[PDB]
């Protein structure tokens, strides 16, 4: 009916962005770790 739909959505975005932010971050060190052998052309 008349319930903040854009609010309930943005809500799942705040919780997903929180864990996501910590995810992608915890992935950079893990990826940058096994990286070396791979890394980029330069």
From TrEMBL:
One GO CC term, this protein: extracellular region
GO BP terms, alphabetized: defense response to bacterium
Keyword field: Signal
Name the record gives this protein: Moricin
Organism whose genome encodes this protein: Spodoptera litura
Residues of the full protein shown: 25 to 66 of 67
